[PDB]
Amino acid sequence: TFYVLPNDDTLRVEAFEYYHTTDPSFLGRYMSALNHTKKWKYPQVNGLTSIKWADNNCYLATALLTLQQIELKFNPPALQDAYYRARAGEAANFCALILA
Amino acid sequence: ISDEVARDLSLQFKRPINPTDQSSYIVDSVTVKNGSIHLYFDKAGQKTYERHSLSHFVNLDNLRANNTKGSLPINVIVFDGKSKCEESSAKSASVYYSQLMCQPILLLDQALVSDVGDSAEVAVKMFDAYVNTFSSTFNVPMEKLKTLVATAEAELAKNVSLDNVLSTFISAARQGFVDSDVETKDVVECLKLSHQSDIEVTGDSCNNYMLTYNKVENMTPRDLGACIDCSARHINAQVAKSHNIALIWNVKDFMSLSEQLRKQIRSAAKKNNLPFKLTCATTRQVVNVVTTKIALKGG
Amino acid sequence: VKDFMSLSEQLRKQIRSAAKKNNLPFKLTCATTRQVVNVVTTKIALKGG
Amino acid sequence: IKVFTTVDNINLHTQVVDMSMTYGQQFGPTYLDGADVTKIKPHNSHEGK
Secondary structure, three states, X not given: OOOOOOOOHHHHHHHHHHHOOOOOOHHHHHHHHHHHHOOOXXXXXXXXXXXXXXXXXXXXXXXXXXXXXXXXXXXXXXXXXXXXXXXXXXXXXXXXXXXX | OOHHHHHHHHHHHOOOXXXXXXXXXXXXXXXXXXXXXXXXXXXXXXXXXXXEEOHHHOOOHHHOOOOOOOOOOOOEEEEOOOOHHHHHHHHHHHHHHHHHHOOOEEEEEHHHHHHHOOOOOHHHHHHXXXXXXXXXXXXXXXXXXXXXXXXXXXHHHOOOOHHHHHHHHHHHHOOOOOOOOOOHHHHHHHHHHHHHHOOEEOOXXXXXXXXXXXXXXXXXXHHHHHHHHHOOEEOOHHHHHHOOOOEEEEHHHHHHOOXXXXXXXXXXXXXXXXXXXXXXXXXXXXXXXXXXXXXXXXX | OHHHHHOOHHHHHHHHHHHHHOOOOOOOOOOOOXXXXXXXXXXXXXXXX | OEEEOOOOOXXXXXXXXXXXXXXXXXXXXXXXXXXXXXXXXXXXXXXXO
């Protein structure tokens, strides 16, 4: 399965201003990864998110566990809101952003 | 001639007559430009508007229907829309002045006119209110504040932005009275939010407490994650009242919350009649309380 | 609702037609709250000068 | 050193003091757990009190 998006430099400049990343191909890869990660399920154990093993997600789950227990703040407001949602169970978008 | 007088005249002259126009109309929107105010209304299904000077709108009591002057400089009558009593009598009372002025009278809701009152010195008034709040927070001697306000007067004469002027004012004033960890931007944002939302501010330590009425079932995931980050707790209202405990939250964390959540929390607090203030402190007070830690049903 | 009323009829019709053509769901509300969420958005305003 | 100070005993307030002078010479009458510290110079273990 594949996805296609046109090119617009103004949108990429705005995305860089919001997210502080200069990658011109960030958006397409991020969307492609997010679409695949949405297929997964993220249950919880002892109030901490658990993930069924798939596509070598062990180190990703370990990083999630590390982030769940430490003081953490981010400069991009979008990333901070994504972390907020992930700690509430919407970990798919945050993981996709981290991988992107 | 209006309908209220047309019938009487027809009865007196013993023959039908045709009225020319309605007695009054209701204004719906207001626009202000170049020291003048524009009023808009719909007449016979079509948009209509008029222009008038803003100078006469300073004194609202002069345009009230019960004015003892007996004359109206303008064809605009100010009345309270929520007051069903006087708004009904205004319609009847407008007839006399319409006949005196030989033209229809415009009905204008009081709240909109109250919002209308505006100038360029309103920013200066807001700055003065911020200074008064800061003084109440810190009780600095008046003379130093007066000197700083005198400098701020020249700054306002320069017509600089409110943000930078207030930042410089607080940075100069904060010396000797504010801990180094506090930043000027935090104070400025807290003052702005306090003015806009009518919230009192104190410098004491926070507690991050909330009532049971703030049910978690309606929570969005983002706000729930924010609550997890701030580590909030629930407590009974009467127990807090017995110990005389108010609602204290960090200004930055409270701002990070959603608008709807903040409005709901404030509404619940006002319904329970609980004092509530925001703070810039990053520490938690320790008082003998019995509270339940808010958390998800993780499993 | 109030902002929608402030708009012109032709603009509302064009917006609704575009939304329907793009299969985009759309609703109205009387609330005064704003959905502050992460989105790459450009503010509709005049050009700089 | 950095130490905590309070009035309602549950609030968040913090003070920073120098160990060269005593507590009383800088601030005044101060006590800690029934022990007078007005005329006592601090040491390392007093951090965080």
